[PDB]
Amino acid sequence: PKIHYRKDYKPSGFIINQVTLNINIHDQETIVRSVLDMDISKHNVGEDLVFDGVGLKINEISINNKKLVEGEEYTYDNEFLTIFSKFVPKSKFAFSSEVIIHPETNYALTGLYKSKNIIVSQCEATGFRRITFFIDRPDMMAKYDVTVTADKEKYPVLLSNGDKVNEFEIPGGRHGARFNDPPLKPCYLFAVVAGDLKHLSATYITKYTKKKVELYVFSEEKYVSKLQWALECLKKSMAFDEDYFGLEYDLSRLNLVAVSDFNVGAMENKGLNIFNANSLLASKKNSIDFSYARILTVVGHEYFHQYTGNRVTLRDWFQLTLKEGLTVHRENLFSEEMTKTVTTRLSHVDLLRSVQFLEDSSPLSHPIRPESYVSMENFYTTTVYDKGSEVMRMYLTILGEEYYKKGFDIYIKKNDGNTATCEDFNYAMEQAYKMKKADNSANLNQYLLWFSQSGTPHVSFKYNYDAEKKQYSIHVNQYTKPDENQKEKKPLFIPISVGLINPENGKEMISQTTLELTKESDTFVFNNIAVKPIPSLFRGFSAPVYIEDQLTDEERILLLKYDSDAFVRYNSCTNIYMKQILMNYNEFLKAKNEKLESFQLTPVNAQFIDAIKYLLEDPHADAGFKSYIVSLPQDRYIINFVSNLDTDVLADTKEYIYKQIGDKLNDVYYKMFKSLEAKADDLTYFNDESHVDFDQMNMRTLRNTLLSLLSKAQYPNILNEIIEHSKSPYPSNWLTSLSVSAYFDKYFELYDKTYKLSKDDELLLQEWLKTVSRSDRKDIYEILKKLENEVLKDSKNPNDIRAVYLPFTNNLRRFHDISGKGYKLIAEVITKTDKFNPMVATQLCEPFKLWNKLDTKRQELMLNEMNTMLQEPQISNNLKEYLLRLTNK
């Protein structure tokens, strides 16, 4: 396999100035004619002209309207079209081709493909070469003039980038549309859509230029009633970029299109953003609450790419985090402002420290700007996205909002209309840094290590207080464990947002303060500190690190009750739980290993339980935050702290801790579940899709979290509550009733009831599938077999396959059955899926990412299945590369 190296970047010996496409969609094939107006670049050295072109059937190819002859003048090997240099002109020339492609059978969903009755493209990263010949890399910027033709009855709506400049009838029931997009773009931002699409539209007027922008949101006819919230989100996105960043949309029209079959969330094709339907479509009757934040997030994300990715684009794919980390950061600023709830930031952190920290301590660990790749499809990772976002967010923490905005505008103004690199962004931030510090000798050279160094830093603390001197010190150390990318890890520039809490009254003792740790260790001293404080460390989770706060549980409780920062409160709770989990895990582990007839477990701290009760009973406290404090840390977060983790022993540990807390607080939980009903389930706005109340949804999250705790506990007569909950109009509630009924003999009654409610909406049925998949059932393998036979069958829809299998893989007790049967099942699904969709097959490998963190028996069982998958003769490039890296081969 060809390995591409970051350091090998060099401009092409060629230029493509103009692309003129004719895409003619027929019943059994699609014919693509393309003329490329090309030139020779200053870097040219008389090389062969080599085009990317994957899976293309050549009808003909020409240069300057002279037909080329295979073998003598060109070779094609289904991957590269090579035109021998003696036949390549030395000045401006036209290359033309006609190829045949087959979207109907393109089940990998890259290139041009059919999703139900919609023809749609996905070209990022290197999928344009599956549509026609190109030098398929993002620094090859060109103008596009695109004509699409199709059967008019099947495909009445035709879309591509740019302005629709002509529409015309064609003999035999066909029609065409021509789209001219004069601004330069990379080919991965090309898109085309054809289908019997229905829409909602609106006009947006920009803040400063007062330009009218037409907004269209499209779906298949069946789901046109689910388009409203997306349109609202798009308006919100435009306003936020205007309001925070001063950035307006530059084009006449923006189209959003939902398709049922999509490998990921959505795609920012210029003026023509294409979405997984689960990330664009919702209605209150047919969607769970999570859809509303999801659509807001994903519409926002694709919109913010119009500047960070589309107007300022990438020199090469090693710069991916420059557009993705930066656009996730913009998306997070947006969603935090729109939701006005602290759980938005907490949910980002929760994801990072479970999923991304697991990746960063796995054999897959990489920096946010890797040094090499083989598969571009495998390059899109939580490290590049979510650690990249945290690295982009640290610039805002370091500079503050005013100077951050100044630096961001410098980046935009300098690079608008051009490709760029991670260095360009750091440069812009550094200019702001000099301004802020009032020191042109200040620099951010050290900051670049965040782009190149892999692994999660560990930051630890020691404290000292002198009562007589009123002097407080915070001693800080950082460490990154060596890994396969760096033998020696350098100290990073780590911004530590801190407060000092007076333990007597809970008040702030210092102003807003961001410690800049730039060495392996440093001591920060504060004078005129009148009493020994409790430190509030890494407020807002100010760096993507393992925090070792070295606080007592008494101190952590005080922060949990009285600190001003939501993350530090949440983290202090997390840290109390982790200390308890590690202690009880070891106690259970020793009892298992030593085959003990009796033994003791350390109980949960009673003052901690009292603090949970205190917060729960506070009517002015936030419902979303409450739902976090009664939930143990994610299993994936816990596994970062345990070697040779015995999943059975962890399951027993969690069970003990939940039971300890429930035995004290269940009556509190029940009282809250009942008192929250009126506000949580208020139907006043149920038939208004413009009205979304994130606090109300958090009240339902709390009610559903409590109901789960009470059902597991077999709280007296709680089945009454479950049955009534199943009658709620909100899918979040009635799907919750299914999962919590797992503990009762009414489970299959609710299975049938909720199936009947779900089966006639494609996306709701996928949510029902997830609910079943994640049900805490002893007979879950039998249930999965029933889903396969009765509902999933041989669907190639990634949303169906992911819904049936991924939630189950998070079942700690059952997926990790010591027989290895869960590992066997998912590997069979991976191999089956790999035949038609390698990218999604590689997603389905997710539960194996922690294989070498488990107990020795489960390590062996997982490794056996990965080696079995690797031995499949027909294994894809994606899956082979991924599993070879994951298994350290």
**Site membership for ligand J6A, residue 127 (CB under 6 A):** yes
Flag whether 169 is marked binding: no
Q: Binding partner of residue 764 among ligand J6A, Zn ion, Mg ion, none, CB under 5 to 8 Å per kind?
A: none
Q: Count the Cβ atoms, other than its own, within 10 Å of residue 727.
A: 10
Flag whether 265 is marked binding: yes
Strand order across the beta sheet in which 513-517 lies: 513-517, 494-501, 534-537
- Determine contact, residues 395/436, Cβ cutoff 8 Å: no
Flag whether 172 is marked binding: no
**Site membership for ligand J6A, residue 125 (CB under 6 A):** yes
Q: Count the Cβ atoms, other than its own, within 10 Å of residue 376.
A: 16
- Determine contact, residues 533/472, Cβ cutoff 8 Å: yes
String marking each residue 821-860 x if it binds Mg ion according to CB under 5 A? ----------------------------------------
φ, ψ for residue 26, nearest 5 deg = -120, 175
Which run of H or of E encompasses 756? helix 747-758
Q: What is the DSSP letter of 133?
A: -
Choices 356-364, 521-529, 562-570, 612-620 (CB under 5 A): range interacting with Mg ion: 356-364
| Residues facing 259 on adjacent strands | 276
Residue at 67: amino acid letter: K
Distances (CA, A) of 283 to 136, 291, 601, 773: 39, 9, 48, 23
String marking each residue 42-61 x if it binds Mg ion according to CB under 5 A? -------------x------
In the complex, the residues that contact Zn ion under the rule CB under 5 A are 324, 327
**Site membership for ligand J6A, residue 122 (CB under 6 A):** yes
Which run of H or of E encompasses 628? helix 623-629
**Site membership for Mg ion, residue 888 (CB under 5 A):** yes
Shortest separation between residue 134's beta carbon and ligand J6A, angstroms: 15
Residues binding ligand J6A: number (CB under 6 A): 22
Q: Binding partner of residue 263 among Mg ion, Zn ion, ligand J6A, none, CB under 5 to 8 Å per kind?
A: ligand J6A
The nearer residue to ligand J6A, 380 or 641, going by C-beta atoms, is 380
**Site membership for ligand J6A, residue 839 (CB under 6 A):** yes
Strand order across the beta sheet in which 111-115 lies: 111-115, 118-122, 192-195, 157-160
The nearer residue to Zn ion, 275 or 567, going by C-beta atoms, is 275
**Which distant-in-sequence residues (6+ apart) come within 8 Å of 489 by Cβ?**
453, 455, 479, 480, 481, 482
Q: How far is 845 from 866, CA to CA, in rounded Å?
A: 9
Shortest separation between residue 95's beta carbon and Zn ion, angstroms: 31
- Determine contact, residues 293/391, Cβ cutoff 8 Å: no
Flag whether 742 is marked binding: no
Shortest separation between residue 301's beta carbon and Zn ion, angstroms: 6
Q: How far is 649 from 591, CA to CA, in rounded Å?
A: 10
**Per the residue annotation, which of 302, 390, 555, 587 is the catalytic one?**
302
597 given a catalytic annotation: no
Residues 219-278 binding ligand J6A (CB under 6 A) are: 263-268
The nearer residue to ligand J6A, 301 or 703, going by C-beta atoms, is 301
Shortest separation between residue 556's beta carbon and Zn ion, angstroms: 37
Flag whether 324 is marked binding: yes
Q: What is the 3-state secondary structure (H, E, C) of 650-719?
A: HHHHHHHHHHHHHHHHHHHHHHHHHHCHHHHCCCCCCCCCCCCCHHHHHHHHHHHHHHHHHHHCCCCCHH
Q: Binding partner of residue 761 among Zn ion, Mg ion, ligand J6A, none, CB under 5 to 8 Å per kind?
A: none
Residue appearing with tokens 């009855």: 153
Residues 311-340 binding ligand J6A (CB under 6 A) are: 324
Q: How far is 702 from 368, CA to CA, in rounded Å?
A: 35
The nearer residue to ligand J6A, 290 or 524, going by C-beta atoms, is 290
**Site membership for ligand J6A, residue 838 (CB under 6 A):** no
Residue appearing with tokens 């010591």: 818
Q: Count the Cβ atoms, other than its own, within 10 Å of residue 271.
A: 25
Shortest separation between residue 714's beta carbon and Mg ion, angstroms: 38
**Site membership for ligand J6A, residue 540 (CB under 6 A):** no
Shortest separation between residue 333's beta carbon and ligand J6A, angstroms: 16
| Residues facing 341 on adjacent strands | none
Is the peptide bond prior to 125 cis by the omega test (within 30 degrees of 0)? Answer: yes
**Site membership for ligand J6A, residue 297 (CB under 6 A):** no
Q: Binding partner of residue 385 among Zn ion, ligand J6A, Mg ion, none, CB under 5 to 8 Å per kind?
A: ligand J6A
Strand pairing class (513-517; 458-466): unpaired
Q: Binding partner of residue 266 among Zn ion, ligand J6A, Mg ion, none, CB under 5 to 8 Å per kind?
A: ligand J6A
The nearer residue to ligand J6A, 113 or 546, going by C-beta atoms, is 113
The nearer residue to Mg ion, 105 or 675, going by C-beta atoms, is 105
Among 500, 604, 506, 638, which Cα is nearest to 560's? 506
**Site membership for Mg ion, residue 485 (CB under 5 A):** no
- Determine contact, residues 622/341, Cβ cutoff 8 Å: yes
**Breaks in the chain after (C-N > 2.5 angstroms):** none
Residues binding Mg ion: number (CB under 5 A): 5
Residues 224-243 binding Mg ion (CB under 5 A) are: 239
The nearer residue to ligand J6A, 301 or 774, going by C-beta atoms, is 301
Q: Binding partner of residue 363 among Zn ion, Mg ion, ligand J6A, none, CB under 5 to 8 Å per kind?
A: Mg ion
**Which distant-in-sequence residues (6+ apart) come within 8 Å of 880 by Cβ?**
870
Shortest separation between residue 664's beta carbon and ligand J6A, angstroms: 40
The nearer residue to ligand J6A, 50 or 376, going by C-beta atoms, is 376
Of 130, 301, 387, 654, the residue at the interface with ligand J6A (CB under 6 A) is 301
The nearer residue to Mg ion, 265 or 363, going by C-beta atoms, is 363
Of 361, 381, 572, 704, the residue at the interface with ligand J6A (CB under 6 A) is 381
Q: How far is 335 from 332, CA to CA, in rounded Å?
A: 5
Q: Which residues bind Mg ion (CB under 5 A)?
A: 55, 239, 363, 484, 888
Tell me the binding residues for a peptide.
124, 265-266, 268
Q: Which residues bind ligand J6A (CB under 6 A)?
A: 110, 122, 124-125, 127, 263-268, 301-302, 305, 324, 376-377, 380-382, 385, 839
What positions carry a catalytic annotation? Answer: 302
